[PDB]
Amino acid sequence: GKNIQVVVRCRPFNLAERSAHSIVECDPVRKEVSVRTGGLADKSSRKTYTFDMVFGASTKQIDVYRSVVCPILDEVIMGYNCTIFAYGQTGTGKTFTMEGERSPNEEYTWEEDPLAGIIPRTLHQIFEKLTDNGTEFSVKVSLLEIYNEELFDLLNPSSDVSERLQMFDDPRNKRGVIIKGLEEITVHNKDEVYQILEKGAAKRTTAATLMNAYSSRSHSVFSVTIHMKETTIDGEELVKIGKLNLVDLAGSENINQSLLTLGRVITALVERTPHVPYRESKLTRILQDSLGGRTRTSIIATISPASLNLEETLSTLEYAHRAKNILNKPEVN
Ligand SMILES: Nc1ncnc2c1ncn2[C@@H]1O[C@H](COP(=O)(O)OP(=O)(O)O)[C@@H](O)[C@H]1O
Ligand SMILES: CC(=O)/N=C1/NN(C(C)=O)[C@](C)(c2ccccc2)S1
Ligand SMILES: [Mg+2]
């Protein structure tokens, strides 16, 4: 098989956009997204697509999590490598979804903030779930940013802020690679996560001021690895290793080698062309497994309601729809 998952999430209007009206309507039950392509004179022309899941503007973070992220976490705990990423135009919610936002004036703890996104939630759930099944386990996390074909580690303490790091192909996995010098931190309890993110958050900032049009132009890849012990009825011991990669892509509005290449790889997979160009960009190289690989991958494509962004929105959905045909064969480690 076995197919990958694509879901669409559309954000609500800004204060700013309030005074417009939407051309996008998502009907979750039917799993469709409809966009009005006509402008002011047609109103009846629509483009509609069907995705595995569709989340409208009414959707809270919690819902997104339960709907797509939870199931994935189950798999990760079983030993699968899972990748989830966000794709969309800038300003449409990728960053929000994957990481979320922290509400102001400590109203909520990090754990209960409802603006929190997938990453922090995921980190939280992991400790809960794992802890609740007894068993020895450990968590390692890493975060890297890819800007302009250069990789920067956001968790490194080093004052060698932008030391480019190097990757090599990994022999153990033919579709994978290792990044030498990438810091991986072992997180021992839920109480250490926030500190990491925050730290990570800061370092990203520095780099922002280290280079041109950052946020919107680079990709961030967050990864968690989990090793859990299990015992069979026969005393044989099992070790499961699972990895979840959560990535926040660069705006689809777009030096952009990683993104282009990605589109290219996708086309190749979908069309069956004999040689697929994973090697052409740093990003595709690390996500090779995800696309046509051994991992289960989910893509969240985020779009916006505003009339203004119609062309981008349409393209975002086109892209998403066609990615639905990638096939992966998920396997357990
Ligand atoms: N589903 C949503 N619900 C509420 N606010 C959202 C949603 N999606 C995006 N936003 C808001 O819109 C702004 C842009 O989102 P951002 O996360 O930066 O998207 P991108 O990474 O695609 O630029 C942020 O202020 C964020 O709070
Ligand atoms: C790599 C990464 O995701 N870094 C983060 N730093 N955060 C801080 C400081 O609030 C985020 C936005 C968050 C949001 C809600 C709840 C908890 C954390 S996520
Ligand atoms: Mg962004």
UniProtKB/Swiss-Prot annotation:
Q: Mainly resides where?
A: cytoplasm
Task: Give the top-rank taxon of the lineage listed in the UniProt record for this protein.
Answer: Eukaryota
Q: What is this protein called?
A: Kinesin-like protein KIF11
Q: Name one GO molecular function term.
A: ATP binding
Name a single GO cellular component: spindle
In its record, the post-translational modification comment is: A subset of this protein primarily localized at the spindle pole is phosphorylated by NEK6 during mitosis; phosphorylation is required for mitotic function.
For whether the record's keyword set contains Ubl conjugation, the answer is: yes
Compartmental location: Cytoplasm; Cytoplasm, Cytoskeleton, Spindle pole
Domain Kinesin motor: start-end pairs: 3-326
